[PDB]
Ligand binder design. Structure first.
Ligand SMILES: Nc1nc2c(ncn2[C@@H]2O[C@H](COP(=O)(O)OP(=O)(O)OP(=O)(O)O)[C@@H](O)[C@H]2O)c(=O)[nH]1
Ligand SMILES: CN[C@@H]1CCc2c(ccc(O)c2O)[C@H]1O
Lengths: 333, 229, 55, 285
């Protein structure tokens, strides 16, 4: 119907006008008087070996002790960072995997792959506790809400929430135009956001199940997302070299991190414990660290040959780990 | 303390021994990706394959050489291509008889797939099914009626025809291959090659053909590695 | 689907009614948090080797 | 005359350095970067180490002997010098043969290449090569199995002031047969087979896709074969000919050929380490 599409445009124009009216001053101008962090130099403290093929993603443990890594060969290996010694090596039925997560209590580990099934493993007993099925597209990310509920994202536009015992979709979130390839959880369990193949990245409410906001700053595919430690802002890294920091209380974006030299995409984004430093990977053989307050570069992390596809920061914030398409890991401090 | 350290050391040791042991098993096998357009006829081709021994995986071994396939079930931009940059070869199936009903669509995928930044060093083993049906349509829907570049491609200069019911069908056979090979030659520095084959609905030496193609690909890769080509 | 167009029509209306706060408050909150939690961050300042467990 | 005294010295000094620098750089590049470390590069390390030991040990001592025309050191020093010289030479040649046969196995049979050569096989092969090298050199020269029956030779052993190389015909024949001719024929057959396979593949490509579109192979094989054959061929022919016919060749010719054979170890990394990854690693340092 002709009228329906227009009604839609008028609403978009009103939203844009409201966002423009809410704008008062540039975010960069506010933090002009902040003293710069300066040069930050960190070196590799440990090197982890034992993987055969390219790795995809990893997740630090709730304690700063352990971490879990997954690779395309089809094995989950739980390292011990302090003594660089393996603990478990769980084979998988399907070789291709694209995500992993580590339970808050430390009693469960989950891994989802290109096969349309999310499976959970029990550490203390290993065997497959339950198999979660129902999606129509390949999985992209998954996180543990608690010991009982897990929220996942799929290649189809749907994002769902499961229950381990029942094994059924308690709630389904729909509205995305294309494929979803990112997800993160707030410090509390109330809210979570996602970034899809379309430039739009929205915010979802777990209990309500209704979308609350929509951000469309970027102009290409979105490949990473994370929350500010406060919980009132989130930063995004897209296929274009630009990295942008959105806001929740005010819909419009605040600052953009980009440079002329960089022409490669971003595959992972994470924040420091204090939130001052924004650490982002790159398609090139490098990992760059920025300053969140004034968009000034700090340092360069090098020592990877193939790519950088995973990144995470420990809860206490003492160490940062990076992954690669090479078989090797790396721990920085 | 020391006993705890001892225990961790012993576990690392068992895990490492088993991981080294499977390293040889992992390195021995060869991986193939199978991709094709709709209604091409890949299910029939997999039949002789299962005879040798969301994602369907096939394991078959010939002459003490292990092969393992990956059929992915699907007009969508694909972000799972990056995950398939380590396969030895890609099997591509195109229905030659399906011109009146889509061929332009298949070629459209081939350039798309031929120019990815992640599949630069991967060669393609190309099959052409529905051979029998092609002869019947040419011998009323003609290529000239549907395609405007049909002129002048009827005869192959190096044509080595099998005894043929139709000199004319031999004209339709080599027009499609020339269109497919026109894209393969244009991009890449010789790191990747195309292997065209002609196969009817009933065929038996498919395993032999794929074995020979894989051997040729590996020999070419090793020759280029040591700077002899 | 005509409905997907219909579904979008009420959805945009729902998301446009939220109150918008000026950027000054959000920027001030971010700056205040970053400045207050600077000491607790072990990556911003080089931790002593003795306190470092990795080294 | 003063020019004769110096020029020889400067030329000798340059030869001693270049070898040390190149071999040290190759060894450091192999040991440092993890990307370059693999099964095929473990063979290069043995050749680099052997050539480095040769260049550090025998070349300066021979140059000093040539310049001073007198052997100040003792007789056991002379025996040790000759022993390590023969050891290094034969070790390098057998390492080259092993590299050639490994390349042949990699090219001709690709499916079984992954299982045949494994970190266990490479270490055993290299240890066997070095053991054969040690057995050929130290055992017969530490004892007096290489002594000559000529009266001038006996006078030479009697005078400790100067030591030269004097051996019987049987030992020379045996050492030459073990060190040179068998590796030469093995390399010839290997590279002929490899060239035939490459020609067959090129013909297949030309027949298959020639409408739309072997100098490189010829040059690549020619450099490797010709350099080694020209460097190490005349010396062994002369080694046979002086033994077969007494008082036929001049000592200057012998020492000149032995010295021109030493330069081969200098140019080995240039031929065998021209890969782009090696270039990147060298430029990084
Ligand atoms: N005459 C003839 N018919 C064929 C040939 N190959 C396939 N067909 C027919 O075409 C049908 C479609 O091929 P299928 O094997 O079913 O392929 P599919 O499983 O639909 O796979 P997609 O191509 O991915 O859609 C087959 O079931 C046959 O009836 C062939 O070579 N000749
Ligand atoms: C003094 N130089 C020696 C003399 C003879 C000799 C060499 C090498 C290998 C042999 O089997 C030999 O008999 C030369 O390197």
């Amino acid at each position: 119907l002709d009228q329906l599409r227009q009604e839609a445009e008028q609403l978009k124009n009103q939203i844009r006008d409201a966002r423009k009216a809410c704008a008062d001053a540039t975010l960069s101008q506010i933090t002009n008087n902040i003293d710069p962090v300066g040069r930050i130099q960190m070196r590799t403290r440990r090197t982890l070996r034992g993987h055969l093929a390219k790795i995809y993603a990893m997740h630090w443990g709730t304690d700063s002790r352990l971490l879990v890594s997954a690779s395309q060969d089809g094995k989950l290996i739980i390292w011990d960072s302090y003594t660089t010694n393996k603990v478990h090596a769980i084979p998988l039925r399907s070789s291709w995997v694209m995500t992993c997560a580590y339970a808050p209590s430390g009693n469960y580990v989950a891994c989802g792959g290109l096969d349309n099934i999310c499976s959970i493993y029990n550490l203390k007993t290993v065997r497959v506790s339950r198999e979660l099925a129902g999606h129509t597209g390949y999985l992209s990310c998954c996180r543990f809400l608690d010991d009982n509920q897990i929220v996942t994202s799929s290649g189809d536009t749907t994002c769902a929430l499961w229950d381990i015992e029942t094994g059924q979709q308690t709630t389904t979130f729909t509205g995305h135009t294309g494929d979803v390839m990112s997800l993160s959880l707030a410090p509390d369990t109330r809210l979570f956001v996602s970034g899809a193949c379309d430039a739009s990245a929205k915010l979802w409410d777990v209990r309500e199940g209704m979308c609350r906001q929509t951000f469309t700053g970027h102009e290409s595919d979105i490949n990473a997302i994370c929350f500010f430690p406060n919980g009132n802002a989130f930063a995004t890294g897209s296929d274009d070299a630009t990295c942008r920091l959105f806001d929740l209380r005010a819909d419009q974006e605040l600052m953009t991190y980009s440079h002329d030299n960089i022409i490669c995409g971003i595959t992972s984004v994470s924040f420091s414990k204090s939130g001052r430093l924004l650490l982002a990977g790159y398609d090139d053989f490098n990992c760059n660290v920025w300053d969140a307050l004034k968009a000034d570069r700090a340092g360069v992390l090098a020592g990877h040959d193939n790519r950088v596809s995973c990144l995470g920061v420990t809860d206490d914030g003492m160490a940062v780990a990076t992954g690669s398409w090479d078989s090797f890991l790396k721990i920085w401090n | 303390q020391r006993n705890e350290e001892k225990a961790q050391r012993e576990a690392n040791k068992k895990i490492e021994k088993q991981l080294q042991k499977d390293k040889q098993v992992y390195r021995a096998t060869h991986r193939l990706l199978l991709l094709g357009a709709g209604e091409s006829g890949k299910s029939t081709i997999v039949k002789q394959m299962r005879i040798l021994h969301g994602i369907f995986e096939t394991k078959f071994q010939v002459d003490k050489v292990n092969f393992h396939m990956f059929d992915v079930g699907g007009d969508e931009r694909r972000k799972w291509i990056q995950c398939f940059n380590d396969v030895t070869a890609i099997i591509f199936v195109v229905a030659s008889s399906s011109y009146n009903m889509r061929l332009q669509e298949a070629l459209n995928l081939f350039k798309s797939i031929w120019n990815n930044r992640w599949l630069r060093t991967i060669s393609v083993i190309l099959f052409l099914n529905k051979q029998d049906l092609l002869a019947e349509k040419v011998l009323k829907s003609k290529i000239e009626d549907y395609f405007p570049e049909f002129a002048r491609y009827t005869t192959p200069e190096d044509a080595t025809p099998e005894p043929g019911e139709d000199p004319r069908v031999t004209r339709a056979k080599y027009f499609i291959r020339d269109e497919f090979l026109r894209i393969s030659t244009a991009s890449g520095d010789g790191r990747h090659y195309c292997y065209p084959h002609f196969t009817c609905a009933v065929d038996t030496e498919n395993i032999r053909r794929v074995f020979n193609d894989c051997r040729d690909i590996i020999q070419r890769m090793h020759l280029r590695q040591y700077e002899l080509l | 689907s005509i409905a997907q167009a219909r579904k979008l029509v009420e959805q945009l209306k729902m998301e446009a009614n939220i109150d918008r706060i000026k950027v000054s408050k959000a920027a001030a909150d971010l700056m205040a948090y970053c400045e207050a939690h600077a000491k607790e961050d072990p990556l911003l300042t080089p931790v002593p080797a003795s306190e470092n467990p990795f080294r | 005359d003063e020019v004769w005294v110096v020029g020889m010295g400067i030329v000798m000094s340059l030869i001693v350095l270049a070898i040390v620098f190149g071999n040290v750089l190759v060894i450091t590049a192999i040991a440092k970067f993890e990307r370059l470390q693999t099964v095929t590069n473990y063979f290069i390390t043995s050749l680099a180490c052997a050539d480095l030991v040769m260049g550090l040990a025998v070349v300066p001592f021979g140059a000093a002997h040539i310049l001073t025309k007198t052997w100040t050191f003792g007789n056991f020093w002379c025996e040790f010098w000759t022993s390590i010289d023969v050891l290094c030479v034969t070790a390098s040649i057998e390492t080259l043969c092993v590299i050639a046969v490994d390349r042949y196995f990699a090219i001709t049979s690709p499916f079984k290449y992954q299982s045949l050569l494994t970190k266990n096989k490479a270490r055993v092969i290299i240890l066997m090569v070095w053991i054969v090298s040690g057995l050929t050199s130290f055992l017969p020269i530490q004892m007096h199995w290489y002594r000559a029956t000529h009266q001038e030779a006996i006078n030479c052993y009697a005078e400790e002031t100067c030591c030269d190389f004097f051996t019987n015909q049987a030992y020379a024949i045996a050492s030459s047969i073990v060190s040179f001719y068998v590796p030469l024929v093995i390399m010839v057959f290997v590279y002929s087979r490899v060239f035939q396979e490459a020609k067959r593949q090129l013909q297949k490509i030309d027949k298959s896709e020639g409408r739309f579109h072997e100098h490189k192979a010829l040059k690549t094989l020619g450099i490797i074969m010709g350099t080694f054959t020209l460097c190490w061929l005349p010396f062994f022919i002369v080694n046979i000919v002086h033994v077969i016919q007494d008082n036929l060749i001049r000592k200057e010719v012998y020492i000149l050929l032995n010295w021109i054979g030493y330069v081969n170890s200098g140019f080995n990394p240039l031929i065998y380490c021209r890969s782009p990854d090696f270039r990147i690693a060298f430029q990084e340092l």
